[PDB]
Amino acid sequence: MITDSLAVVLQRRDWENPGVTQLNRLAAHPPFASWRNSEEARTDRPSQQLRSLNGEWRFAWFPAPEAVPESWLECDLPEADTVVVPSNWQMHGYDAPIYTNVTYPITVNPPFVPTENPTGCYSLTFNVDESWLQEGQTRIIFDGVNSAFHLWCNGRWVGYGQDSRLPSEFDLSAFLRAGENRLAVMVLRWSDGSYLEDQDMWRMSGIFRDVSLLHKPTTQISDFHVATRFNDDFSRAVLEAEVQMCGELRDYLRVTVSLWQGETQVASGTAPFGGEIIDERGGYADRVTLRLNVENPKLWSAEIPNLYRAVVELHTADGTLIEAEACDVGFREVRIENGLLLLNGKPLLIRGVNRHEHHPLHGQVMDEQTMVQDILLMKQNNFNAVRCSHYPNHPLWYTLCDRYGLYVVDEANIETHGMVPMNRLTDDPRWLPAMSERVTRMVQRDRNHPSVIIWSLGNESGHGANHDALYRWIKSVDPSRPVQYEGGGADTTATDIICPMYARVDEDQPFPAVPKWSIKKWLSLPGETRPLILCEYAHAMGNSLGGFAKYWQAFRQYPRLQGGFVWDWVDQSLIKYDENGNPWSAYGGDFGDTPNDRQFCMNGLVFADRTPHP
Amino acid sequence: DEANIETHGMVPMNRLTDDPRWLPAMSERVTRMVQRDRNHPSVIIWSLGNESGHGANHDALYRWIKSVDPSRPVQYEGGGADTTATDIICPMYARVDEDQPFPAVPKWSIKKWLSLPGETRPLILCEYAHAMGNSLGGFAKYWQAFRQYPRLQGGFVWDWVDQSLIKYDENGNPWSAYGGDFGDTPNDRQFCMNGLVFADRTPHP
Amino acid sequence: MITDSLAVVLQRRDWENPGVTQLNRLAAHPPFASWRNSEEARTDRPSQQLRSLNGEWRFAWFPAPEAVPESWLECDLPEADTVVVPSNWQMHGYDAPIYTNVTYPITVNPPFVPTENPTGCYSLTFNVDESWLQEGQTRIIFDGVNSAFHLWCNGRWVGYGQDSRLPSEFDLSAFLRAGENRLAVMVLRWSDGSYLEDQDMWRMS
Ligand SMILES: [Mg+2]
Ligand SMILES: [Mg+2]
């Protein structure tokens, strides 16, 4: 019909305009999946409401989005294969992936894209449950897409999304019906969001993470925050939690927050809705804040975990419960006082590594069995701090970085390392809305976890006014962690701890307008008090890590230096088969692309198997 | 000068400001002001908004003015007029000798503001001496304290011109109309004058 | 045609979504008006390039944006008066303006608006110069509209704007042609931008 024919969805193009970044999306929230009985919140058994949609799908490939036929949304075309999803369409043998270091693939001309976008068509037929259409809403969850995508449900239009790494969730309440249902998704290659991500990595595009479906009752809970505070002797502790609900309001609803450890319990609390007057008419009528207190805690550190367990549930006054969610919790406190990065009243010494998400066989897809070999092979070799570079990861990495013992540095999705000069798209304030939807929706996803201790804005994107604008927005809505930023010389107002890249130890080299002084010379300049943690040191391609012993004398003699991060952990290689069947590791631009850079894709501390370097 | 923000109806008055889903629509009314009015020699103080609560966004735009133009100060009123989003204190309707306490947003006395522990900034009033009907009584007591103390600076008077509308009878002679007499519901029926002169113009006493 | 029929401009509604605040707008700049010889910059004589379009226009009033007929953009309806522009349609005697102090006019429910928006239709026929279509671009400047508005040039679609007080400027380079030309503008009463302006004043549009 109209306007759900393909002649009217396409023009006017939404993937060329930086003022339209989304249509019909919901808010962000920490992941909870909403199981029903109160008992399984303590045991973390697999819930029955959360339903997964992995498996086999229908697929077809088109050279441009203007040549796709109109009869696709009615029934499936006879030319489709069967493709397992999640996967990229680059590795199956349709196109050739490209690799660059500093230059954009397409011609530089903002905000346009060329007229040959390789576009793809996915299709799926599924059955739905009978009772799910009677009451409540059924939320549909995409955890990954690259880069921009349109969606159709049963021959009608739903929405549109832009961002690549962070998830996207849609509402699908009144559309579907009993029995069988269709879903048709069209995926695009290049869009305006490609002008803000230019990391040193391979270039692939598709659906590469999980896809799931979820069910909620008509009254639900939406958000909740957990915060802790301490006295001076580390002997008495105060927990406070804030619970955000939604939907229909009544009077007789109650909440309950129970704190569990092992099998016994410690503290509990209930309260009804409403309170805490603020300026100046009234107070919030949808929130509650509960306070509990504990004696002699078991603290979280890098050496010993000592996790707790928390259950937050919503129930009536007699009464049967409706919802219960859970989040893990541990106790610590991070602060800067008099010029040292202090944790639990002790100075700290960081030794870490950068990690870049990659796999040789399946492309960008990460399974479960790889993330345990990474943490087990980091702990045995005396590391305790990992930096995710340069985008937020799968939502399961953090809880494996809770139970084992290492620190995590997190990052938004901004890099502009191609423009001339490198602060054109940042200082110009026409790009403030599209740039401030990649930092806000990170903090609301990753704020309950106990592992993250340092936020970071971006990397290699110059200096401007926007990086000063978002900085108070993190430092005004969460005051318990510091904020770090590198580019522009690593001295400016948009940071709190100095972080140069690739700074030497004794000699120094001057540049015009962005020097790199010596590491013992930074601290003695007139009017400088902050500490210094390196963001990148000791590049490691081929035979490298020479002169490494000279850093670890100065790291122990001086009081105020703190350590650094090592680039890089794992190689980025891809596999390819010959006529014999034997494989050989491929690198750079050998697939058949122009241009290329042909050696700067290894950066290896281990191989891609994994098997350790010397 | 001033941007275009007021949210004096919601419950509480920082719902649409603290929630960060409204940051793009709210940051297109301050940026496009500064690029229009920055060459003129008359404007000396920027101001963000009025009567819109306190939140994170009013801290977010503040460094954006103070990082692209450093030659003028920035002023903001709501929330108690003491917070981090301002540089000069500006309460509205603060008295001279007596004080009145409220929960969570007091209005202390004007000689008492400056002597609190850890306070150094000046004080320019944003609104004083409401002037509907016979008013401006007790006006002489402000202009003794404005000349004795060093660090007080003065204030702004609400309001200059009336807001009346005209309407014709069957005779042809006019009469000044006010409030909700056109035929609307609801209305407020006296708070539209606020006059220091009439609507002609012809001066009040 | 498609998509410049009125059945496809309206849904999906852009005046209910706080993520869409503009379509096809240019940057901001201090006002300069671009006269040609170097001598008149010192004397500030009236420039010849800057051309004003005040005067008389065609007008009609509709109770809701869903009942407007489709043959309006072809030729003008026979039921139009002649109205001098700039002016508000409240003072001519079509509706009744409203006044409040603290409460919103419509029912509080963000981000929606009710389904009876009083909408208006302006129309204008004008001649253009011959040499202006040969070289260079011809920028069109609106210095005020309340509140959200759509625009049509010669039966084709151009853009959409939201904000009330600050100006708005569009590009009109490749659309017009020699001789005579039409402009049809449709103005809306309430939109999402009404949830950020609540000053103590009269309510006109
Ligand atoms: Mg780079
Ligand atoms: Mg007010």
Residue numbers in the entry:
A (entry chain A): 2 to 615
B (entry chain D): 411 to 615
C (entry chain D): 2 to 206
From the study:
Here, we describe a new approach that we call specimen preparation on a tube-reconstruction of average subtracted tubular regions (SPOT-RASTR) that helps overcome the common challenges with cryo-EM preparations. In SPOT-RASTR, we sparsely bind His-tagged proteins of interest to the nanotubules and use the RASTR process to computationally erase the nanotube membrane leaving images of the protein of interest. Here, we demonstrated the efficacy of SPOT-RASTR using the 520 kDa protein β-galactosidase (β-gal). There are four β-gal monomers in each β-gal particle, thus a single β-gal molecule can crosslink multiple tubules.
To overcome this problem, we first applied the tubules to the Quantifoil grids, then β-gal was added to the preadhered tubules. Instead, it appeared that while the β-gal was tethered to the tubule by its C-terminal His-tag, it was still free to rotate around the His-tagged peptide, and thus a full 180° set of views of β-gal were achieved even with the particles that were bound to the edges of the tubules. The SPOT-RASTR particles were subjected to 3D single particle analysis in cryoSPARC, resulting in a 3.58 Å resolution map. No evidence of the lipid trace on the map was observed indicating that the tubule signal was successfully subtracted. When the Euler angle plot for the conventionally prepared data was compared against the SPOT-RASTR data, it revealed specimen preparation on the membrane tube filled in most of the missing angles in the Euler plot. However, in the SPOT-RASTR β-gal data there is nearly even angular coverage along the −π/2 elevation (bottom) compared to conventional plunge freezing where there are very few views along that axis. A slight decrease in overall resolution (∼0.5 Å) appears to be the trade-off for utilizing SPOT-RASTR compared to the general conventional preparation method for β-gal. The loss in resolution is most likely due to increased ice thickness due to the tubules stacking on top of each other. In the case of β-gal, it has a tendency to crosslink tubules due to having multiple His tags per protein.
